Amino acid sequence: RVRSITLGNSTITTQECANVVVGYGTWPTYLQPTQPDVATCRFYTLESVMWQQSSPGWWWKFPDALSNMGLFGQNMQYHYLGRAGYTLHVQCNASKFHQGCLLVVCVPEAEMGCATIANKPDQKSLSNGETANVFDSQNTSGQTAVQANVINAGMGIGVGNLTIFPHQWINLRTNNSATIVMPYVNSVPMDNMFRHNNFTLMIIPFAPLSYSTGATTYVPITVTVAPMCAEYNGLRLA
């Protein structure tokens, strides 16, 4: 019924009945000498976020989200060129007296618009590393701010069409988790992990959280990330 998964020196627990979404039907694989690194294939658990009846949604940019994360974060600095796939585990802690529904979606090349049309968004507004950015329910206003109104997913599209990207729904009535496997996707086989975010993870409520009186007023959402088949440019003589 319950499965224990160990990678490196870290262990997490998932359910055996949980479904797995493999984006684009493709599993991550290995690919001017290139050096693989398996020392980083462990689970990195991000600080959880709290889901309130009024939460508009959250997002993370991945190569950046793990930039401070130990050895993975170090390989990004010692090597200049590289690639990796990821497994993303998203779980909610809720009782049978809670209701609500989330869309958990991974979006490739999620270029985002600016609150001011004449400008481009700043680096921090686009990503705060391991700290989640928050979608707005209203229109965003600022000079370098990301236009975060959730209705357009910050991209100028309708939010209900994000289902075109690898995703899973979490309906607290039936499931409290999602697993997404994201293959490396780019126009080039390897890139500079500090100048480009391969994908963005977005968690957007479509059915507001609510609960019976006396129940806990919020639901924790945890995101755990496990890199796969990471590869970097070699650092030695030929």
């Binding site: 658990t45 959880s48 809720a94 009782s95 809670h98 129940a215 945890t222």
Partner: protein, 169 residues
């Protein structure tokens, strides 16, 4: 296995409460729940357990130990804890993130009522800490907090070498 008096603070030592690690359902996220020096023959937490008592009759000993953590909240309670182990000489994590980057297990009480660790090394130190990854989510407003019980025993072939008077008389 015997029950470990983890909450052996002044005023708790004289009660059964010494064994009851409190869990505050609405505590600050990322705060420490509990933790201790992992030394069976010296730490006040472990030296009076069945394992701890036997080892106090020997000058030298070594082996691995097993630690079991059991959650005793309501059936409908859910949430996560981070159980982390700090190898000998590594000190102890000061934050949840630091603990997360070392060796650990995420314990989701909604799936597993208990979690078991086996320390590769215990000798005549290292640390165990537990962090509040999430709060504890319940369907109803309860009268009190939740407790965790901790148990300890020898894990593998454990060895002792020279008999001595116990220090407890």
């Amino acid at each position: 296995d015997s029950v470990v008096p983890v909450n052996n603070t002044e005023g708790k030592v004289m009660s059964i409460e010494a064994y009851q690690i409190p869990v505050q359902s609405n505590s600050t996220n990322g705060s420490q729940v509990f933790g201790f020096p992992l030394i069976p023959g010296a730490s006040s937490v472990l030296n009076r357990t069945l394992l701890g008592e036997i080892l106090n009759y020997y000058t030298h000993w070594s082996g691995s130990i097993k630690l079991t953590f059991m959650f005793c909240g309501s059936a409908m309670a859910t949430g996560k804890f981070l159980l982390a182990y700090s190898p000998p000489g590594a000190g102890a994590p000061t934050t949840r993130k630091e603990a997360m980057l070392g060796t650990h297990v995420i314990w989701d009480v909604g799936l597993q009522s208990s979690c078991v660790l086996c320390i590769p090394w215990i000798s005549q130190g290292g640390y165990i800490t537990c962090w509040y990854q999430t709060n504890i989510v319940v369907p109803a407003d309860t009268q009190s907090d939740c407790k965790i019980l901790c148990f300890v025993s020898a894990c593998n072939d454990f060895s002792v070498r020279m008999l001595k008077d116990t220090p407890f008389i």
